[PDB]
């Protein structure tokens, strides 16, 4: 009847791709974020921001192509195309790293629009919005790593660039400069991700090996109806198996499947907390009591103190190339080396 | 000691640029994605068996024969979230996919460690982009190489006597 | 030398949240015993 | 005092949730002790 109601009827119409009200935000922003990433990794260089080749036009493959972060000189500028750095010039915008902030900001609103899509579809189908709650994990990772981490640092330059090997640099930059493996919030993140892949494999294989004989074929995939009411696998046998193998088994299918939600999402949320701490350099770098003991006792060696010598190697050997704006000139005499290497 | 093992392995074998570690990361990122995905859609489509005061997990009785969640409603949700043809209506095919993706991913990355044991290392793209004059243009693989160089000149700092770490 | 306030942070950070959960479990079983009606209800 | 409150509910914690919470607090204490002691 009303003009709002005619548009609300058209947006929520059951078609091939559901649009909804959230698709007015998701479908523009996610298309420009994905299409901006393909444009940058194919055509756009990093020669003026980082001094790198990062596109397929320059000879990069899929592993080494990236949409690189802007130059360190522009700071935390939004780098709008019309803004005071590019001033409408599209070519100069791509050369100062404007596509990075294009992909990161339109990708941030795509993740908002996708989580709003999960709320909208669950309200129409009539179910509970737990998939939107579980997507807050990936949202907290993207917000804290791609936005909140460079905002606490000097510029957008120290953010992860949108590439495969560029992400690999970001992993090793944060070991050398932040000791990110030592951080207990990354450790809780590793436990949630490896615990989530474990829960995927155990629950996947337990169901598949406690199936009921519901057909005569050796191919057991045919013996299931999507509208059936009987359980397709024996929970009593599955509980009996793991109680004698592992000592402890799930007895509740509802608690089992909530736990499959809980573990990886907690891992993404706990690791997002420690990367907010690395934005301010509030890092778990040193155990001072071991650093004080190893200072006054030159045989006290642990695997802890061996990892600090690896970090001092990373911070000296990569810093001239990874921060080229800084003009780090290290002579060979000041670079820390071991003997003969 | 585990982190010391990881860093020295990256300097000596470039495991990040090995596609078998990449399949392993897709195994554990995908596996925890599919765990959170499958765990969401079951919890989203649970059938009313409880009140607001008691826990939702008390709607399941151990040993019951009936299904505890509407798998048609979960398929209709995920079929509208992406598109209809990209969703498992077969619960047996879905749980098989939950088993296969992390296990094959961890099998492949176990055969990355086992093949980097014999120094068949990850991809080396150092100084592979070269301009017309012949000068080396660096890439992100070259900046990754500068971090590999920093670990390897500092690892086992008294153990080496000769210019190549052949062990 | 380690920080001396960490002995308080670890041991009270262990014992007080653990004894809170032991408290919650015990009153759950005592409430079930009172509702059961025999020899443990009083 | 006004009347007896009709919103009063019982609280539960079964034995599984006790073991999960005892494990969580002990493991968080195991994890964070090395950092607190520094």
């Amino acid at each position: 009847r009303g003009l709002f109601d005619l548009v609300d009827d058209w947006l929520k119409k059951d078609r091939f791709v559901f649009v909804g009200w959230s698709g007015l935000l998701l479908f523009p922003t996610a298309y420009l974020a994905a299409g901006g990433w393909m444009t940058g990794t194919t055509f756009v260089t990093s020669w003026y921001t980082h001094g790198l080749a990062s596109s397929y036009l320059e000879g990069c493959n899929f592993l080494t192509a990236a949409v690189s972060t802007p130059a360190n000189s522009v700071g935390h500028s939004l780098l709008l195309l019309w803004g005071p750095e590019a001033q409408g010039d599209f070519t100069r915008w791509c050369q100062i790293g404007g596509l990075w902030t294009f992909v990161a900001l339109h990708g941030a609103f795509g993740l908002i629009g996708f989580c709003l899509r999960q709320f909208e579809i669950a309200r129409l189908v009539g179910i509970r919005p737990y998939n939107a709650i579980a997507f807050s994990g990936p949202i907290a990772v993207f917000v804290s790593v791609f936005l909140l981490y460079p905002l606490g640092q000097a510029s957008w330059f120290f953010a992860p660039s949108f590439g495969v090997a560029a992400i690999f640099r970001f992993l090793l930059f944060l070991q050398g400069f932040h000791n990110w493996t030592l951080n207990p919030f990354h450790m809780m993140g590793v436990a949630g991700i490896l615990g989530g892949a474990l829960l995927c494999a155990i629950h996947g294989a337990t169901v598949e090996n406690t199936l009921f004989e519901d057909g005569d074929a050796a191919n057991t995939f045919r013996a299931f109806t999507p509208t059936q009411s009987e359980e397709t696998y024996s929970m009593v046998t599955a509980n009996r198996f793991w109680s004698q193998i592992f000592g402890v088994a799930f007895s509740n299918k509802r608690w089992l499947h909530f736990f499959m939600l809980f573990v990886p999402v907690t891992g993404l949320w706990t690791s997002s907390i420690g990367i907010v701490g690395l934005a301010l350099n509030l890092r778990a770098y040193d155990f001072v009591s071991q650093e004080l003991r190893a200072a006054e006792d030159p045989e006290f060696e642990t695997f802890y103190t061996k990892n600090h010598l690896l970090d001092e190697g990373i911070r000296a050997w990569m810093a001239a190339q990874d921060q080229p704006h800084e003009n780090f000139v290290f002579p060979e005499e000041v670079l820390p080396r071991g003997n003969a290497l | 000691g585990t982190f010391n093992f990881m860093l020295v392995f990256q300097a000596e074998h470039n495991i990040l640029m090995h596609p078998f570690h990449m399949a392993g990361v897709a195994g554990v990122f995908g596996g925890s994605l599919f765990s959170a995905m499958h765990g969401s859609l079951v919890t989203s489509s649970l059938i009313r068996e409880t009140t607001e005061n008691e826990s939702t997990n008390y709607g399941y009785k151990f040993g019951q024969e009936e299904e505890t969640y509407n798998i048609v409603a979960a398929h209709g949700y995920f079929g509208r979230l992406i598109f209809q043809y990209a969703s498992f209506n077969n619960s047996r095919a879905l749980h098989f996919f939950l088993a296969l993706w992390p296990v094959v991913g961890i099998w492949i990355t176990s055969m990355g460690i086992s093949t980097m044991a014999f120094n068949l290392n990850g991809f080396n793209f150092n100084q592979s982009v070269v301009d017309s004059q012949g000068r080396v243009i660096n890439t992100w693989a070259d900046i990754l190489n500068r971090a590999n160089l920093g670990i390897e000149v500092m690892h086992e700092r008294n153990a080496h006597n000769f210019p190549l770490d052949l062990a | 030398e380690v920080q001396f306030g960490a002995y308080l942070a670890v041991l009270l950070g262990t014992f007080l949240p653990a004894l809170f959960l032991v408290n919650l479990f015990i009153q759950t079983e005592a409430r079930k015993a009172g509702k059961a009606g025999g020899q443990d209800s009083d | 005092m006004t009347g007896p409150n009709p919103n009063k509910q019982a609280v539960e914690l079964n034995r599984t949730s006790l073991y999960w919470g005892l494990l969580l607090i002990f493991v968080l204490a195991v994890l964070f002790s090395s950092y607190f002691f520094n």
Binding site: V236, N239, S243, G247, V248, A249, S251 | K61, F62, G63 | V2, A6, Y7, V10, L11, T14 | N14, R15, T16, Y19, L22, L23, F26, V27, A29, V30, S33, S34, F37
Partner: peptide, 30 residues
């Protein structure tokens, strides 16, 4: 002296695992 705390936390964690396995609430039907 902090190794006393480290030992007590690890041995205390294993005692919880012992009671979680052998003093578990047995799953019962009906």
């Amino acid at each position: 002296m902090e190794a006393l705390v480290y030992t007590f936390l690890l041995i205390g964690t294993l005692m919880v695992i012992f009671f979680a396995v052998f003093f578990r609430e047995t799953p019962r039907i009906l």
